[PDB]
Amino acid sequence: CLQNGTRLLRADGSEILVEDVQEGDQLLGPDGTSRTASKIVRGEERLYRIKADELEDLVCTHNHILSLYKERSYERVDITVDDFVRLPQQEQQKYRLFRSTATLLHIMSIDLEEKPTKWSGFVVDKDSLYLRHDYLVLHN
Ligand SMILES: [Pt+2]
Ligand SMILES: [Pt+2]
Ligand SMILES: [Pt+2]
């Protein structure tokens, strides 16, 4: 569940708005093969803005699942946005976002937006992973 305006990659490589995704649309997975989106859902609520270095901010819902990497080389961990918000900063600094090109990115801030915002979401087959326009790996 991402904020409207988020740009995702189709199976061919071109971009598509998250609000423009429809049932059966072909997204791009982190391994290069295609993904099928289905069960489109929309809403409007106060979202969480995750600011990381280099890459554009990620605005998502409270129940959004983040595919992160944790130190101790690195281990792959899926964690929801709410639990990650509740973790202390000393623990938050151990988690990293990642993009497919295997670049690791520091998560350095995450705050709740002031005003509500429209959001769109869906489910993804296979490993349930898809790519953002900047190749950031995202989970259902
Ligand atoms: Pt979601
Ligand atoms: Pt909710
Ligand atoms: Pt997962």
Residue numbers in the entry: 1 to 72, 90 to 118, 132 to 170
Q: Which sentences did the original study use to describe this structure?
A:
Crystal structures of the apo- and cisplatin-bound Prp8 inteins revealed that two degenerate cisplatin molecules bind at the intein active site. Our results further showed that cisplatin inhibited Prp8 intein splicing in vitro in a dose-dependent manner by direct binding to the Prp8 intein. Mutation of the splicing-site residues led to loss of cisplatin binding, as well as impairment of intein splicing. To explore the potential of the Prp8 intein as a therapeutic target, we developed a split luciferase-based Prp8 intein splicing assay. This revealed that cisplatin, an FDA-approved chemotherapy drug, is a potent inhibitor of Prp8 intein splicing. Furthermore, we used biochemistry, mass spectrometry, and solved a crystal structure to demonstrate that cisplatin targets the Prp8 intein as the mechanism for inhibition of fungal growth. In this report, we demonstrated that cisplatin, an FDA-approved cancer drug, significantly arrested growth of Prp8 intein-containing fungi C. neoformans and C. gattii, but only poorly inhibited growth of intein-free Candida species. These results suggest that cisplatin arrests fungal growth through specific inhibition of the Prp8 intein. Finally, we found that overexpression of the Prp8 intein in cryptococcal species conferred cisplatin resistance. Because the processed Prp8 carries out essential and non-redundant cellular functions, a Prp8 intein inhibitor is a mechanistically novel antifungal agent.
